[PDB]
């Protein structure tokens, strides 16, 4: 305990009071004097017609030209976005994939899902074809997100209510992150890769630290399970999409919400969220078959990326911000610009 | 195109490989195995030969069955049950000896799921002999207070089947009910005929004639 429960309740009340004391003015009351970006008419420049099953993940290369797409067909095809060509087609051991990653160096591609294993594949093998460099088996739940810190390091979000930092050289969990009440369904590494935020299914987004291994802040502002997350390019904010048909802009330093990108005509939950280079546009995917483009400072729909026959599961903006790639369940990876 | 002609050629050949893999993977009948913990799932999957997911693929009458034992996933279903669409059927196993509310609730939640509106669920009521012995030992009203009727084995089985079929609300799907005594290997022929019926129905629906 009773004393411990009372202490937890009073600590939560103090945290909420401190967070609400710093909200002198909302985002919409200070940026209301700028011109909106208007109708952002983006046309499908490329369409990756190579997958035959639902696309559940897609990641952009550091060169903004190669993109890896993972589908339930058991394949992880690396795409040439400039010429639509495919440079690799890796047959996965387990076809039940829910996440994929591309190393910033470009040598490695991750993969994970219901197999409880985050596999690492060596693209630049001297023997030609891609070989599985490691199979990280330490999770008791389904892997939901994986990001490369470097060629050797990797952080994984799993469905056993925890996140684990791995070591691809040895295969053992260097660091484990515990504290999520529900399933951790999203993860996004910061630009400096010194920290990351995991958006779990308990309507909370916990800010972790890779070096320290302990959580710093929790963001309990949503009303349903968080299905997507993405850092603001400045690295001091992030937008988390949930099943409540709203994606909110959380601030790390303010430690609270900034704007709720919700519309009265939207009931479908977010499945993918991604920012532009400047962060003004938040291309947040929806289960309503459209990847709406949200003005991050106006909280208004700048444009709609209609053209997907099924729910979009992964939206990815290039590192040079030239194009945005949306991977929906209709086995299509469309490139918009 | 200076040497991008070889790059295109590689893209085309691996696209042909992807197409061949897709053709070779569409022949496999995907069946999702669900049910309450310790409900004969291990026994029924062992009777058909061969940590999170345990795929048990096998071939029966020139038809490749892929049976997925996803009961080991210690997480909520709704965040990963959406990847199990396009499956032929959901195989449901219930131990009639041990009583039941969890099994019925999970059946109601899985049959009314938006993704599984069209995917008909195969229902298995195993431990029939053990259930009859328990009926001869204990009444069936322990877990069914509202069940009024004869206390025989046949009536109890009929009541359980009715209570399980009273959970779906979509006419496009049918629940196939089978009873097993945990000592017969003929539980796969029922699976085969149910799968063939579902394939016929899905093909008719896809042609617009159903």
């Amino acid at each position: 305990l009773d004393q411990l429960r009372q202490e937890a309740e009073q600590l939560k009340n103090q945290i909420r009071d401190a967070r609400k004391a710093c909200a002198d003015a909302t985002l919409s009351q200070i940026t209301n004097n700028i011109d909106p970006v208007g109708r952002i008419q983006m046309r499908t420049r490329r369409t990756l017609r190579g997958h035959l099953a639902k696309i559940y993940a897609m990641h952009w290369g550091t060169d903004s030209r190669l993109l890896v797409s993972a589908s339930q067909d058991g394949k992880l095809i690396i795409w040439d976005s400039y010429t639509t060509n495919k440079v690799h087609a890796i047959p996965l051991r387990s076809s039940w994939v829910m996440t994929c990653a591309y190393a910033p160096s470009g040598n490695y591609v991750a993969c994970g899902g219901l197999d409880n294993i985050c596999s690492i594949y060596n693209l630049k093998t001297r023997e030609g074809n891609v070989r599985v460099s490691r199979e990280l088996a330490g999770h008791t739940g389904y892997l939901s997100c994986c990001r490369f810190l470097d060629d050797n390091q990797i952080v994984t979000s799993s469905g056993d209510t925890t996140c684990a930092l791995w070591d691809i050289e040895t295969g053992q969990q260097t660091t484990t992150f515990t504290g999520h009440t529900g399933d951790v369904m999203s993860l996004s590494l910061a630009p400096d890769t010194r920290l990351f935020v995991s958006g779990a299914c308990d309507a909370s987004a916990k800010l972790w630290d890779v070096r320290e291994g302990m959580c710093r802040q929790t963001f309990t502002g949503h009303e349903s399970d968080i299905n997507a997350i993405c850092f603001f390019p400045n690295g001091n904010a992030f937008a988390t999409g949930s099943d409540d048909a709203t994606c909110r802009l959380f601030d790390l330093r303010a430690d609270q919400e900034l704007m709720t990108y919700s519309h009265d005509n939207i009931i479908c939950g977010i499945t993918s969220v991604s920012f532009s280079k400047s962060g003004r546009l938040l291309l947040a995917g929806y289960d309503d078959f459209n990847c709406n483009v949200w003005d991050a400072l106006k909280a208004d729909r700048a444009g709609v990326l209609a053209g997907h026959d099924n729910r979009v599961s992964c939206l990815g903006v290039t590192d040079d911000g030239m194009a945005v790639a949306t991977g929906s369940w209709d086995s299509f990876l469309k490139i918009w610009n | 195109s200076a040497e991008e002609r070889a790059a295109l050629e590689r893209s085309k050949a691996i696209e042909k490989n992807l197409k061949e893999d897709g053709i070779s993977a569409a022949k496999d009948v995907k069946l999702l195995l669900l049910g309450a913990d310790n409900s004969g799932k291990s026994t029924i999957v062992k009777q058909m030969k061969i940590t999170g997911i345990v795929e048990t693929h096998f071939t029966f009458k020139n038809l490749h069955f892929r049976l997925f034992d996803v009961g080991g996933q210690r997480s909520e279903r709704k965040k990963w049950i959406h990847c199990f669409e396009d499956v032929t059927a959901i195989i449901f196993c219930v131990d009639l000896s041990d009583y039941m509310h969890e099994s019925l609730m999970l059946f109601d939640s899985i049959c009314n799921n938006k993704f599984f509106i069209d995917t008909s669920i195969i229902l298995f009521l195993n431990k029939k002999d053990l259930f009859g012995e328990k009926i001869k030992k204990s009444p069936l009203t322990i877990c069914f207070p509202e069940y009024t009727g004869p206390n025989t084995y046949e009536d109890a089985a009929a009541y359980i089947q009715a209570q399980f079929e009273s959970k779906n609300r979509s006419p496009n799907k049918e629940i196939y009910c089978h009873m097993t005594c945990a000592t017969d290997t003929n539980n796969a022929q029922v699976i085969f005929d149910a799968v063939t019926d579902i394939i016929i129905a899905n093909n008719l629906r896809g042609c617009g004639l159903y």
Epitope: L66, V87, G128 | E3, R5, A7, E9, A13
Partner: single-chain antibody, 234 residues
Framework: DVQLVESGGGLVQPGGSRKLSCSAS????????MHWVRQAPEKGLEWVAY????????YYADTVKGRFTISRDDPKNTLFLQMTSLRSEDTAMYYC??????????????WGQGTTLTVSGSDIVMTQATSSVPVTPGESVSISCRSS???????????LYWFLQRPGQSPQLLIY???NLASGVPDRFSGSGSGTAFTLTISRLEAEDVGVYYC?????????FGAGTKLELK
């Protein structure tokens, strides 16, 4: 390890035929485009034939087309080069070269040991003015190469390949596409160029780096090599 071994060499009477087999192991042969590069006993390298993965496109040299035959055996993981009507100009060592083609790939990366065979207009012309650069170890040696047609394609890829053939050894790729260092090559090698004027600047030359260097173009077949810049001690 990755290894290419050729066989089927020896003295051949003029006007006959012979089959040269390139056995391969340690790598995925089925997904590689195997080349056949010939080197005269006293002259530089010269491209002969090329075959891609799946035996889709087969190209040939100006003086080789119509007589030779390049084929693969993917299940046997061996490369073949059938040649008929051996003229006196075919007396040379035949090298086996692997090359995989995709975005960011490194063609011509691994060379075979080589087999010795003895018989008793619009193509890009690559000219190397410096045929001998005697430089002591510890100094920087730069080899220049020129092309009749600009090698810079529309997509920004300039196709100039630099090789190093140590005496008694097989050529080793150093820089591919005139800017990208090969796999395992020491970082001291630097590649540069613009359109036609290409230079392979080497820093801190060592005793093990003594050899002859070549420049190869891949903009359009046939792939023509240079005269060969030979580096000697002191």
């Amino acid at each position: 390890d990755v290894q290419l071994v050729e066989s089927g060499g020896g003295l051949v009477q003029p006007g006959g035929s012979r089959k040269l087999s390139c056995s391969a192991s340690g790598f995925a042969f089925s997904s590689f485009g195997m080349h056949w590069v010939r080197q005269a006993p006293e002259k530089g390298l010269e491209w002969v034939a090329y075959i891609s993965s799946g035996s889709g496109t087969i190209y040939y040299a100006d003086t080789v087309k119509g007589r030779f035959t390049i084929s693969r055996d993917d299940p046997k993981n061996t490369l073949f080069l059938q040649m008929t009507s051996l003229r006196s100009e075919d007396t040379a060592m035949y090298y086996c070269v692997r090359s995989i083609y995709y975005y960011g790939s490194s063609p011509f990366d691994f060379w075979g040991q080589g087999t010795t065979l003895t018989v008793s207009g619009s193509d890009i012309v690559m000219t190397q003015a410096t045929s001998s650069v005697p430089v002591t170890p510890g100094e920087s040696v730069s080899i220049s190469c020129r092309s009749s047609k600009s090698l810079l394609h529309s997509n920004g890829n300039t196709y100039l390949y630099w090789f190093l053939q140590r005496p008694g050894q097989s050529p080793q790729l150093l820089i591919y596409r005139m800017s990208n260092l090969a796999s395992g090559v020491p970082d001291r090698f630097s590649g540069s160029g613009s359109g036609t004027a290409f230079t392979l600047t080497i820093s801190r030359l060592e005793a093990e780096d003594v050899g002859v260097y070549y420049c190869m173009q891949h903009l359009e077949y046939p792939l023509t090599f240079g005269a060969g810049t030979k580096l000697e001690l002191k």
